[PDB]
Amino acid sequence: ENFAGGCLTGFMRTPDGRCKPTF
């Protein structure tokens, strides 16, 4: 299956529970 590695718009959310924008 597939999972959402995206937090907000342009945010790389990890299974670590943290969101880092991709800049």
JSON list of C-alpha atoms in Angstrom, two decimals:
[
{"chain": "A", "resi": 1, "resn": "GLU", "atom": "CA", "xyz": [0.00, 0.00, 0.00]},
{"chain": "A", "resi": 2, "resn": "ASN", "atom": "CA", "xyz": [0.93, 3.68, 0.03]},
{"chain": "A", "resi": 3, "resn": "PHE", "atom": "CA", "xyz": [1.31, 6.19, 2.85]},
{"chain": "A", "resi": 4, "resn": "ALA", "atom": "CA", "xyz": [1.27, 9.97, 3.07]},
{"chain": "A", "resi": 5, "resn": "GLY", "atom": "CA", "xyz": [4.71, 11.35, 3.81]},
{"chain": "A", "resi": 6, "resn": "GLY", "atom": "CA", "xyz": [3.32, 14.83, 3.47]},
{"chain": "A", "resi": 7, "resn": "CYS", "atom": "CA", "xyz": [2.45, 17.01, 6.43]},
{"chain": "A", "resi": 8, "resn": "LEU", "atom": "CA", "xyz": [1.11, 20.35, 5.16]},
{"chain": "A", "resi": 9, "resn": "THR", "atom": "CA", "xyz": [1.71, 21.91, 1.73]},
{"chain": "A", "resi": 10, "resn": "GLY", "atom": "CA", "xyz": [5.34, 21.20, 0.88]},
{"chain": "A", "resi": 11, "resn": "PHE", "atom": "CA", "xyz": [6.00, 19.65, 4.27]},
{"chain": "A", "resi": 12, "resn": "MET", "atom": "CA", "xyz": [7.81, 16.35, 4.50]},
{"chain": "A", "resi": 13, "resn": "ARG", "atom": "CA", "xyz": [6.21, 14.59, 7.44]},
{"chain": "A", "resi": 14, "resn": "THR", "atom": "CA", "xyz": [8.05, 11.58, 8.74]},
{"chain": "A", "resi": 15, "resn": "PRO", "atom": "CA", "xyz": [6.86, 8.57, 10.84]},
{"chain": "A", "resi": 16, "resn": "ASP", "atom": "CA", "xyz": [9.00, 10.30, 13.45]},
{"chain": "A", "resi": 17, "resn": "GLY", "atom": "CA", "xyz": [6.02, 12.60, 13.92]},
{"chain": "A", "resi": 18, "resn": "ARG", "atom": "CA", "xyz": [7.73, 15.70, 12.61]},
{"chain": "A", "resi": 19, "resn": "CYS", "atom": "CA", "xyz": [7.14, 18.00, 9.64]},
{"chain": "A", "resi": 20, "resn": "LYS", "atom": "CA", "xyz": [9.95, 19.62, 7.65]},
{"chain": "A", "resi": 21, "resn": "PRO", "atom": "CA", "xyz": [9.16, 21.73, 4.55]},
{"chain": "A", "resi": 22, "resn": "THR", "atom": "CA", "xyz": [11.02, 20.74, 1.41]},
{"chain": "A", "resi": 23, "resn": "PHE", "atom": "CA", "xyz": [12.96, 23.84, 0.41]}
]
